[PDB]
Amino acid sequence: ILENENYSKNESDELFFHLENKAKLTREQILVLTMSMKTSFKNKEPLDIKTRTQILEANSILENLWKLQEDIGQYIASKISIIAPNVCFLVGPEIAAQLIAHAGGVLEFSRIPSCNIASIGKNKHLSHELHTLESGVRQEG
Amino acid sequence: VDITMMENYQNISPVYSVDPLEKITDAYLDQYLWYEADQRKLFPNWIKPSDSEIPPLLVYKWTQGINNLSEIWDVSRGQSAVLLETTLGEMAEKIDFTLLNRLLRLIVDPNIADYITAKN
Amino acid sequence: GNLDQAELLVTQALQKFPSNALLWVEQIKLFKHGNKSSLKKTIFQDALRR
Amino acid sequence: GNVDLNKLTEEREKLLQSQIDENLAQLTKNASNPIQVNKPNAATDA
RNA sequence: AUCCUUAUGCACGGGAAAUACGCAUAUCAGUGAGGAUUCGUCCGAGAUUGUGUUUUUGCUGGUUGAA
């Protein structure tokens, strides 16, 4: 998104793109990103075109990898009523798939100690992002 | 943090009784930042209350300033002085923490800012 | 190619001589390979302790 | 003066069984009042 | 037979605290209580509820007054 250019210095769709194109971006996240940009993002055209190209390539590869992972997860979910039925019963199939996928197999998951399971699928705990809930539940995930 | 509400009859609220252990830490931070800020001139001359002026003194100073501008009381040419006062309403009560945190990260070490945010 | 075996060997070595730093180093290296990519920091800490 | 609730009362009368009445859940303090009392009192046990 | 480690039981001695210490025909708890975290993970034993005392329990000594 950052690279894109064209109308990006004022506002493309700049703050529009984040919410839509990078689907994950929540308002809080976006605000902090904006703040960072205002302070530390140098916004001088990329060190070299070569560098830019490389970054693009990386993005393409990374994205592909992510997609593959997602597909795998989906497959696991589809299967898991056969794979890890008890777990599914306890929780729900999608959740089970997510857990199991993260682990590796079912065996891997089993090997994982219970206290850790909690914080699987947690969004990387940022210092700046607020945490305390009315719940008192530190993990989420 | 517990909030015993106050008893200023005309309008109540609020008193936040923070944990005694944390309080020390908070206190130190308050002392340090304020010291540091004063050293480094974070806050402009215009912000009050200063350490120098007792509020009546401050008022007096303000009055003097108002008097002691160039040709302020002249209204021959159709001049108009205007002394806008206002309460910045709900200022403390709608400080967004993310934004606040970011702002702090300009003026303090980020860890400190983070801590502050957490405490709030 | 065999990494599980290596790990086992390392463990055995540790059991026999715990304080030996080379064994610890080897273990660390193995960990870095990225089968676990976890229990990594803890392992490091343990190594340091020993 | 007690006009808004009369209908409700009537409805209640119509509906309830004896068994139901017998098995009312003898109620627990949702706002954990006694605990609070114990705590504050302990703190300010003079 | 001598020396040492561990736990416990009895005790000499010394120290701190009792806002602490219990008790329960309770409810739940290493088949996870409660917590940490740099977020990768880590520690791992009580928690809940009820309730009894809690500026104190048991015993002594003195002066005094009372008269």
CB burial string C11-37: b at 16+ within 10 A, e below: eebbeeeeeeeebbebbeebbeeeeee
Report d(CA A20, CA A24) in Å as an integer: 8
Report d(CA B58, CA B18) in Å as an integer: 32
Nucleotides, chain E, CB distance < 7 Å: 19-20, 32, 34-44, 48-51, 53-55
- Backbone φ and ψ for B2, nearest 5 degrees, come out as -90, 140
Report d(CA A135, CA A13) in Å as an integer: 36
Ramachandran quadrant class, A105 (left: phi over 0; alpha: psi -120 to 50; beta: rest): beta
Q: Are A141 and A122 spatial neighbours (Cβ–Cβ below 8 Å)?
A: yes
Report d(CA D30, CA D36) in Å as an integer: 12
Which secondary structure element, helix H or strand E, spans residue B3, and what is its range? strand B2-4
DSSP H helical segments within B1-120, as ranges? 20-40, 55-67, 97-107, 110-119
DSSP H helical segments within chain A, as ranges? 14-21, 27-39, 49-83, 85-90, 93-103, 106-111, 114-117
Which secondary structure element, helix H or strand E, spans residue C9, and what is its range? helix C4-16
Interface contact B98-A28, CB threshold 8 A: yes
Name, in order, each residue with C-beta under 8 angstroms of A33's C-beta and a sequence gap of 6 or more.
Answer: A18, A25
Which amino acid type is present at position B4? T
From the candidates B100, B101, B109, B115, which should be mutated to test the interface with A, based on the most A CB atoms within 10 A? B101
**How many CB atoms sit inside 10 A of residue B102's CB?**
21
Angle at D4 between CA D3 and CA D7, to 5 degrees: 90
Question: Cβ contacts (< 8 Å) between A130 and chain B: which residues?
Answer: 97-98, 117-118
Report d(CA B98, CA A11) in Å as an integer: 22
What was the structure determination method? Answer: cryo-EM
Report d(CA A55, CA A42) in Å as an integer: 17
Which secondary structure element, helix H or strand E, spans residue D38, and what is its range? helix D33-43
Q: How far is the CA of B4 from the C1' of E51 (A)?
A: 29
- Closest C-alpha to A56, from A19, A4, A14, A15: A4
> How does DSSP assign A95-127, residue by residue?
HHHHHHHHHSSHHHHHHS-HHHHTTTT-----S
Paired residues of B3 in beta bridges: B16
**How many CB atoms sit inside 10 A of residue B113's CB?**
20
Is any Cβ of chain A less than 8 angstroms from the Cβ of B1? no
Q: Are A99 and A86 spatial neighbours (Cβ–Cβ below 8 Å)?
A: no
Name, in order, each residue with C-beta under 8 angstroms of B47's C-beta and a sequence gap of 6 or more.
Answer: none
Q: How far is the CA of A63 from the C1' of E29 (A)?
A: 46
Question: Cβ contacts (< 8 Å) between A127 and chain B: which residues?
Answer: 110-111, 114
Q: Are B120 and B37 spatial neighbours (Cβ–Cβ below 8 Å)?
A: no
Interface contact B114-A129, CB threshold 8 A: no
Tokens read off for B13? 């609220």
DSSP helix/strand/coil, B82: coil
Report d(CA C24, CA C48) in Å as an integer: 9
Q: How far is the CA of B59 from the C1' of E42 (A)?
A: 57
DSSP B108: S
- Closest C-alpha to C31, from C20, C50, C46: C46
**How many CB atoms sit inside 10 A of residue A100's CB?**
25
**Resolution of the structure, angstroms:** 3.6
